[PDB]
Design a protein around this ligand. Sequence first.
Ligand SMILES: CCCCCCCCCCCCC/C=C/[C@H](O)[C@H](N)CO
Lengths: 235, 234, 234, 60, 227
Amino acid sequence: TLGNSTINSVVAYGRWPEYIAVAACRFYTLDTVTWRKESRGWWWKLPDALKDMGLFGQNMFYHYLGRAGYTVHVQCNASKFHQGALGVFAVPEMCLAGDSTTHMFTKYENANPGEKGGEFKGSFTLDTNATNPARNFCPVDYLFGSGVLAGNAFVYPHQIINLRTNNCATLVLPYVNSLSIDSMTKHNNWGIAILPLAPLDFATESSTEIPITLTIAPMCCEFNGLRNITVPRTQ
Amino acid sequence: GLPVLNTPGSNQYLTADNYQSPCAIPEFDVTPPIDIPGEVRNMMELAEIDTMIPLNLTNQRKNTMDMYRVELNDAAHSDTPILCLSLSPASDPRLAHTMLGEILNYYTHWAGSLKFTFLFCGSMMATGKLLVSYAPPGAEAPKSRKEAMLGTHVIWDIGLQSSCTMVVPWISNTTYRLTINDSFTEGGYISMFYQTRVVVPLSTPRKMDILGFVSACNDFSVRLLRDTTHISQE
Amino acid sequence: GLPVLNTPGSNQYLTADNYQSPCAIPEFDVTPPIDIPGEVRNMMELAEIDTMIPLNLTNQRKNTMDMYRVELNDAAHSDTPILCLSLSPASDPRLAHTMLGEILNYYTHWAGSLKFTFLFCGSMMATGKLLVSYAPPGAEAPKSRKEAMLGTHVIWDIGLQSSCTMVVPWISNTTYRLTINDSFTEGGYISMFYQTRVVVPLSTPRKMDILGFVSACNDFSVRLLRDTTHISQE
Amino acid sequence: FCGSMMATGKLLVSYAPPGAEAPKSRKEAMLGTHVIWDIGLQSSCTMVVPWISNTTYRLT
Amino acid sequence: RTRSESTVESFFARGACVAIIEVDNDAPASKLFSIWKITYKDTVQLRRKLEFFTYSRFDMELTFVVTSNYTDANNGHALNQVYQIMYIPPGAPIPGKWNDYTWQTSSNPSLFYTYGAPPARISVPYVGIANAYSHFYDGFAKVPLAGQASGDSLYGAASLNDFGSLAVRVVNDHNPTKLTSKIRVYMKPKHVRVWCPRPPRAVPYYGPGVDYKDGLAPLPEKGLTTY
Ligand SMILES: CCCCCCCCCCCCC/C=C/[C@H](O)[C@H](N)CO
């Protein structure tokens, strides 16, 4: 229980979140995504995904500096006759490859999608529109979206949701950064990547879909540098 | 001044030397470190992390996610192997690009035990027993469960538990093996077989996937740092 | 003689080295020092001295004395800013050429609090209240007293006292800021507003001047000595 | 929950103190007090609504 | 069997080439001085080794190997050359000509190397403005604000890895004959601490970021039931 919100667990690097506001930092439920047979994966950025969550987003945009750990709870239930496996990875500094011949050309509005996040692709497509480039991420699942083999992503803090065994995953991420505190609007400290390690299947049904829900609670929150409100440009 | 005599090796630059040099920014006030999570002291700590094995490197599967999945079915029992692996953790293409293999490709000599974990990703209604075997080198690679049973092995009941670990203990004539394909320092064979068949009830998927992970044990060590073949510049 | 081996870096001249050399005038009888007033041990001691800010760098004012004077009047209250400053003490053209800025332009990194003093130079019969605000970076620069009031600020009563100091405390994501214009190490905004208006009786000047001074606080420090851009040779 | 033993699912039960518009979606409900109920784990779930009032008593 | 050679110190205890700076000694198509921005991302081997981790602290040892040659046969002889390597920290004035005043290097550290001497060498401590170096930065230097026109900074680019440049020239007045020189820069991290291990790069690098363009199919073909 954290605040008025209530409900194996993995503590990233064995380090519980710690201090170097209090009401605002509680469990928030993002929009549900649909796991299909042909799904490739999903990603979110923290604190970006929580930027429109009650008082936590207000504190994000009213302060120059902020820091927080997180507790991420992935929820996905199915029957005993379903099969499939998900890998949930927490990546510090989760930089994703772009889609253009120009290096680092992804624009701010696409790098910070919010609680909807983005999806991995099965292959790499190069954006050719030069007059109006998309300037979006093109994260390939087997390259883990950053030019590394997804099979080695298990070096990151992670959990596995095997449908025959468990239906939930819990990751406790401490604040990780080269600084004690940073700008929450400039920098995403954590990334969450969910990849289907084993494809979803249900007997004699090429139609089954099951929901995945993420609930994220910021922890050990600190804010500093109160000023007027930041209003980032949107697309 | 003091009489001195210049020995051979004077004025050479050895890139592996350990010498003092003058500081180009004296009296710099260095930023103190903070307690960042996830500090690493030894590269072996990374080799001791389980990473998924790209076992299914077929023409249509390599360089996709399908290369990580090995398919089982509920067909009748057979003695044909499910998977066959060479115990060459740095030169076998299926182990070379795991975290363990990537670390090994920066060194010339390796020794120590290995850990292979297998995760069954079928329905909860599926049952079956599998045999996982390691054969030390020297004989022909086992092609049936009869030959595989003679080596080290474990029996995995998926119904009882969804993940099973087999430790391959260090057994070598030499004190270290080379990180390349070499007959004199060959490692052996890892094989998987059906002990019984996989059984499912009705209204259940009849095909399912297993996944493989490999890591090093606490007795693992490497020697003779060297450049890798996994990165090149054009 | 003694066996020696010449390591790399031999025979180089590093202008920042610290080595001994032979004395070209041995046995010189050096004149002893006297107790001269005004000795300095640290360049930061010079950066801790208040110097006047050339705030009014307009076309007709720059490179004259008028660039140091900011004019107030007794007009009706408004929320328009009186002055706007970027907290870039080495790269903002209004702070770069103060003593603090001149010292900062010999270094690459700076950290610590700043002190801004404002002196009101009207008649003794003038009254008024002003608002002086610092907004940390990240948001749009405040364009009205409503936005400025949300940041750090002080209220200055000129009738009560003719000089008022606002300390801008050190607030940064990084441990040091760069002495150039850089977005990642931006400092924030300093702004001045009318809290009430300036009121004068009859037979009194209706326009007057304020002056600005800046200095560093005792927690200030700099790093990585470098050449300045404020002097050049042709 | 009175379904079959083969049924699974997670439900969200929320209490919102008064003052704002009544929540019409899970996004608004999640901001108040709430609990997550896993029917597969347990068939009965209790949410305590704690006493939160401006007045010392409410009228019936 | 100890793990002495797999410690983080031993893993990085090598001088790795990171740059080849080319200069010419000629009368003023030539380049009488060169500016190299200090980075380890011009090469691949050291970059891949470092990007096993997210954060790092270390001192740096720089070694300079200088080679030179005549451009034309029997065109004449030359006297031994002296090279100046001046560190220009960010903000210091940048040379614009071979003979401009900036080379006086009153406050910039400078190194004078005589050709034929053993490679030059200096050391610097950990100079990061943050508590550690960032190999990866998932953010922007500027947040674009509503009202701003079409805060457009590049993704991942931040001044936390801005360390200045090296300006390299030949101090000698120009010979009657043209000479070409190359200075190879070798980096060795020392007293290394690292944090947050990452999977190693699997496809060719493309730019200073993590973008990929080519060679996306690294793994070969291998039968499932073949040893
Ligand atoms: C006087 C001759 C020149 C000697 C001075 C050399 C330049 C001073 C060192 C600047 C470079 C700092 C070390 C660089 C560290 C790496 O780039 C970081 N890992 C970046 O993430």
